[model samples]
Target chain A: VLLLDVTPLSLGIETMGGVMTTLIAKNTTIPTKHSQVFSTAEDNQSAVSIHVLQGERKRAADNKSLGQFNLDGINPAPRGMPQIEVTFDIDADGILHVSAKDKNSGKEQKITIKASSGLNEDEIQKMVRDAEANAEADRKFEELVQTRNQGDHLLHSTRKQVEEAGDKLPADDKTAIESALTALETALKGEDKAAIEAKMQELAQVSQKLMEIAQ
Target chain B: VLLLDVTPLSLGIETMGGVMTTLIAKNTTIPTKHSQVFSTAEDNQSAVSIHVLQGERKRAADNKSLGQFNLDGINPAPRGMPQIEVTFDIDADGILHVSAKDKNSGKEQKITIKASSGLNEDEIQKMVRDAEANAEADRKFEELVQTRNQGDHLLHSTRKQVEEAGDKLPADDKTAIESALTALETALKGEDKAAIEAKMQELAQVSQKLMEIAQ
Candidate 1:
């Protein structure tokens, strides 16, 4: 099954000023992990809830919430005394499973964000598998047509250049050139792709030889 | 200021068997015409030349040429009458146009086909001008944003439908509905187009009543 990574959602507890300084941002490649430190909002606050939000909005209300976790059993410390390091990790399926630890006291908290739109890992896998065959066929057909058209266009341009040069070339070289043209045209008319490809290779070799002889 | 009929070539000539055959093709809307008819290597022929040509031909040579009108002063009718009717018409563009009156006459003839590529009189000037403007704007804006995150790329399909539907509706009603989405979006922030257009007239009437009630 194909795996797509989603960016990590930034998580942090509110500060005294109520300003949402960024913990993570958009364009951070998926299945990412990041950590940030935060202190208590009030002096001697025992616990604080880590609110996780997604989107570029600076306000908490404007962004989507991915649940919250609380850091408890603080040592009755004053504000900024208990430095908490919140670690946010999003999984391959864009599931936001986070873990936070108080760096000073070794206290820990964890929560997993609920998947939205009912698009679970299994559903995405099933849909991808169903579309793989058709998508692969279309891609291969386009590649073949592109290669064939390039060969055709090269052959056509070369033929035009030779015709425009006319009888200026030596008789033997002109006869060889005419023979090559007839062979290529007949091969193309028959739609024998293999013969056409062979003729193109021969034509290139002959033209190169002619150019060398002319020089 | 040039007035010209669509059919610039004449058709038909009298044949030997009293048949009126077409030498110059009919139903062809062209400014110039040319054709060549052959004669049997026999002696002097009759007063009429008959040749019939058909438009949809499997082989160009196998096509029939309608009967041709002979020179009236020719002698006694022979095995093959080399009568050729070739008519020339001069248009305002100083182009000599030629068409045949009959094809059955075994007469060698050539008609000069003179045609120019330009905007036809049947085409509306406004549409042609508008098409040119559209093409120029498209080329200039080729690199602009053509797709969004959700992949609803262009309004081409929607705009085409609106244009085709506009002709059947009353002018005021059509303009009111057509311009409603743009007007509502311009006037209000984050108003959904379908919702605003559906309720605009009713909302305006209600707003007027509210202003009257306040006064």
Candidate 2:
């Protein structure tokens, strides 16, 4: 079986003062979890905006935000009153998932950041399908080129053998060889894999016959 | 300074039949080193193409390439002969760097891979610059707004006090208060911090007059 290796991505949470608090650094493997805690910004603000970003940078604003979520319904209190806990979890595939908990309320909010950059899921899927179609066409073209080369090698090798030992070759053997060569020549003008294979097999049989006569 | 963390990229070497042999797993930190020994593929082949890629997938095609280099000037030994050692080193920034040494001739080749498909260095730097610019603009805007609001509040409060006590106030108190009110109104129109401070000092003198009148 073939094997592949991938690098892990950096993960972090944004603090109230717009600072980025890192959890996981880039190139770290997934299936890892880390958490960080931050306090409220203003008195009676009652809500906090959690900006999750990924990058090796000092400020939260300096990093690329995975997304931002708001925690509401907090008890109205003075600044630095409530504590918010954020947890970042990365799966084996290197996809990040986030969970936030309000310690006082014991309510947890969870979300998965989907890879969506302006384009919707359906549009992305359609684009992938079109790319697949183009790739398949390219593969078919390569296959045709390979088959043509194989056919040319067979014809060239058989002709060389027959010319060097044709004087000692039998009539049936010679006729079979010529017929197979004619078929292969015709098939070479067209693009058909089955026809090319049949011609190749026939050529192989004729070459064997000529060898037998020579021996 | 903002702290950045990165997950380490997995490292592996190519084996016979174009198979990838995994050396280091993902989630490991960078500035790491790992080595793997590889045998010759065919007798008299003399050279092998060392293709390095990063991914956890099953095929080389599925992974992203670090770089491709060749190991040459090897002993013309038979197949299955171990003749080369390959080493992979990744930096803290998650950049993949590779070095290969031919065991037989002591020849060496080195290369570095710049990966940017997902939040690469340039992309990350651009994002951080944009965020910093945004934060700077927001900070300046907020400071201007705050100073403007403070000027407005001071002007309103001082005017109300003068109007409410005008009849009972002393002549000197009235004059100083009116001058202070005029200066504050002028400063508020022009949003200059120095002008605002000058007017605020005038207001303090007027307050002293009001206190004297009360005495």
Candidate 3:
């Protein structure tokens, strides 16, 4: 089978807010290219320091520092005026090539990543095993969250409907809907996700009958 | 400053050697794309399993297993004949999109990476610090390797030149060049990188004079 691989970590540069301004997100397929334009943060700045990082963190400092270089000879200009275009390209071999071009001077500098510290073979293998081992747990957690969200949405709409048709609906239908709604609320407060899901289905049945009577 | 980032690890699939057939190399710039064609390993194979991995290790098992999927419904054919095209695309957000197309059947499948475990904030931060602390030592080591390589190259060429001009040139020039070559070899064995670099420079000067005399 033919195999297509992706990047393991996010790639980005340090921006004004000390945040990692991601140029390429983690798990992207290989042999891709992307570019973005940025400006100087300080007025009359003649040089800019570009810090390259890799990781899944939001903060620049929280990511692995690949390297940093200075892009000198920037035309002195007001802050946020001079445009510098940065481009990232990953080739078939998964090696990165970065380029920075000054739009005004037409000057450009490029780098081929040579050495950057990252996880070793053992660490990577362990992480893979851990992910596989936790796969079932992760799936169940996701399912629980999704079910809870659906339950909450249904409860909200049902409550609104009951309020709108309070006097118009038969007393018995109203009471049954209210009772189901209360049960769902109670189930949501409990620790059992399965119980909450069952209660949601029960409430949906009662709400469906109440809607039929009201109409 | 503008920053161009790269993928942190190599991505590839397992091939005949029990080795990774790297489609994309580590340190490749982000937002790139690459594609490769592969064929079944066995005759009349009905399905192909593609295992995607990340790391620098030579063996597939040593690397991190991102995930794997099967490409079934292949026309049962002999090994090394059927064409399967795999493509990997990394977007600006660093998310990976992968696709596989059966060239003969025109069937295709695609996947977008959603959940892949990676380093957290604290682990990434520590790596950054460790890299910073080792930067000076790394540079010195690189310089030593470069100097040694240059020294070897010069020595090899100079020895050839001396052999070709034996006795035609003054004995003193040949002697001096050989002695300098010997000193460079000795310096390479020492722990002092600076001394080796200096010895290389000294050898270059002597080789230059020898070349002049040979002319």
Candidate 4:
């Protein structure tokens, strides 16, 4: 009887923000597969670049590149409309096969990396340790990115609402919006998760109040 | 100039394990598009069902199903091989156009749910509040699901190691592995995240010790 093998490091692809979105965590049993959907960042994208990486780094550029390919012949469409599903499959023989497919056009491409992780046993162990050590750092970074996106919408809409309401909004309400924007911008500079989220909520509340009054 | 509209509820698809994987979060500016890759659950599965849902629920079954369609004609392969990319696009007119494409076969289908959310203004507001309140709950649920998956692999491998080592492993270590397995299983039944993860860590450590000795 034969036992299964496992990968020495995490495997993932480069996502939109240069983040390494992991598909297979380290120590996962071999002969396994994972996939995720990706899309065009710009309108009328005819091809999507697939960057295959292997490492414990949070960013794709920081990781070791296993291979790369492009899924071509995509029907031109607006950003995010075209779907490119990427799959990472590792067989028991330490071979990593990556496939990218354009769902609509049936165009696809793939690359294979054969037992090419250059690290020895100790280095592999160190990589695993590094991943564990930076888990919190990576999690926090992701949290901040999402929070900032939500805030962008909040701030954009809030400013637009106030600009339209101009004279209709009272000075008290007007000052609140100005102050809230400043507070949120300041919070965004640091790594304080709770504080940033608080400021975002404050902006939301003030914006809601202003909108109701204008209506 | 016209202002952008936002969706009242989140839009997502039913993923593996019946979990609702959100693509467009609630309050996301409309005319925005998002996509994710899905795959066959069973080997040689030729059709992947796309369940389009909208609501605040974490489980797919709990969310309101906007509609569903199947992208068929998949080339036969093992689970997680076929790339079925699903896209959720909400236009300015509150139309949710869902599309699923099989990258290899070019077989695809789509459905449009036009302004069909029946919730009124007050109910919509309530839904927003509900989504906010349960954001933590949903996140916690996802964390648990992932942790459990890791533990499953850990337990399966550990048991195989001990079973092969049988009379060779020391009684103390054998007991430790047994204890760790019991502890992790117990933790899985509860919602205490820290406890479950700690138990999983214990299992991993003990399993590593056993595997080394067996080797």
Predicted candidate 1 versus true structure: per-residue lDDT over B160-180, tens digit per residue: 234434444456554554464
Report the error of model 2 at residue B113, Å. Answer: 1.7
Return the TM-score for each candidate structure: 0.26, 0.27, 0.30, 0.41
Question: How many residue pairs clash per model?
Answer: 29, 21, 26, 1
- lDDT agreement of model 1 with the native: 0.43
- Each model's DockQ? 0.01, 0.01, 0.01, 0.02
Better TM-score candidate (2, 3): 3
lDDT of 1 at A38: 59
Error of 1 at B67 (Å): 99
Question: How does the DockQ of candidate 1 come out?
Answer: 0.01
Regions of model 1 farther than 4 Å from truth: A1-4, A8-14, A115-215, B1-215
Best model per lDDT: 4
Which one wins by lDDT: 2 or 4? 4
Q: By TM-score, how accurate is candidate 2?
A: 0.27
Candidate ranking (TM-score, best to worst): 4, 3, 2, 1
Clashes of 1: 29
RMSD of 3: 28.3
**In candidate 2, which residue ranges exceed 4 Å CA deviation?**
A1-215, B1-4, B115-215
Once fitted onto the true fold, the runs of candidate 4 whose alpha carbons sit more than 4 angstroms away are A1-215, B40-47, B57-62, B72-78, B152-199, B209-215
Q: Which of the two, 1 or 4, has more DockQ?
A: 4
| Candidate 1 C-alpha error for residue B123, in Å | 54
The residue-by-residue lDDT of candidate 4 on B72-146, one tens digit each, is 876654344345667888787878888997755557799888886635677777766776688757655665666
State the displacement of the C-alpha of residue B199, model 4, in Å, after optimal TM-score superposition.
Answer: 6.0
